[PDB]
Design a protein around this ligand. Sequence first.
Ligand SMILES: CN1CCN(c2ccc(Nc3nccc(-c4cnn5ncccc45)n3)cc2F)CC1
Length: 337
Amino acid sequence: MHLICQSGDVLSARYEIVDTLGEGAFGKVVECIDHKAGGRHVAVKIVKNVDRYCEAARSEIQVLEHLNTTDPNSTFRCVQMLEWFEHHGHICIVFELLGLSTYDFIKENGFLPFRLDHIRKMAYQICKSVNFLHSNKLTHTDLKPENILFVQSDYTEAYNPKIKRDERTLINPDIKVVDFGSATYDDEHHSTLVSTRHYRAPEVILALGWSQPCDVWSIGCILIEYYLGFTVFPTHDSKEHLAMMERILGPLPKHMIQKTRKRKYFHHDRLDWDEHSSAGRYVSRACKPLKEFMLSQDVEHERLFDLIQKMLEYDPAKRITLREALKHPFFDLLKKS
Ligand SMILES: CN1CCN(c2ccc(Nc3nccc(-c4cnn5ncccc45)n3)cc2F)CC1
């Protein structure tokens, strides 16, 4: 992989590598000068030569040709793919250049949460963009802070004596959504497993089928991370996740516990869980009812926490849609002149 990129390398006799932006399971994204587009800077994703990622990359291109044709102005803030190509048998996708991820900024800002007026603007653009997928019979399936990128990443730094550390604040918190490698059409085959551990919806964990709603869950989880600076679901393990869900959101619905073919996770009608074990005590300590995480009782926090609660509905049918989410009172303050 690194054998196929170094600063100075030229790709498709067009793109000159100046910087690695970041790496991942997929491969790496590099910043390039495009010599045949007036020296415009672009991001190029170089995909690991594994069929798994090869397949993912190829569908990502078909989804983005679709989204780009449907929204040529990029009004719904999906990342714009400019073109793609092959370099030593690795698939390469060229995008408009974006800054670092909402995850990166949190991490670099000392794992501090975003301030609320930024969460509102970011939550809206995430909901508008992902709803545009939902309007076009697509589910992203893999929403997480890492896959939400800032257009501009520039920030001011200032010492907050409220928290006794230096705090970084975005100038422009505008975001776009990336990684359509896992995006599935309503008419296409649905994988048994989708989404990253912490942002997996309960319908997905319990193998009850999934669709647009499994995205709304993930967003719910994103907005908590932004509010706190850490996930409220810190775990790799499936059963542990449901146990944390139970402590924060309350008991799983009767019908979902009934219908699930993953009966490994249940003992009659309750989660098969020794609360007095390694994972057990950890959950009792690390989790509490959702509303006990609110840092303020200010009206603006409660209306955010009402949306998060609506997004974390256990039943995907009842679960608020993003068309409704965009109407929620939390966003009234964006629409005031
Ligand atoms: C530890 N962090 C270090 C920073 N990393 C990082 C920062 C900025 C971009 N930029 C960029 N621009 C346009 C498009 C894309 C993009 C398209 N598709 N994808 N897919 C997955 C991830 C990014 C993108 N990325 C890229 C970076 F990797 C992430 C990992």
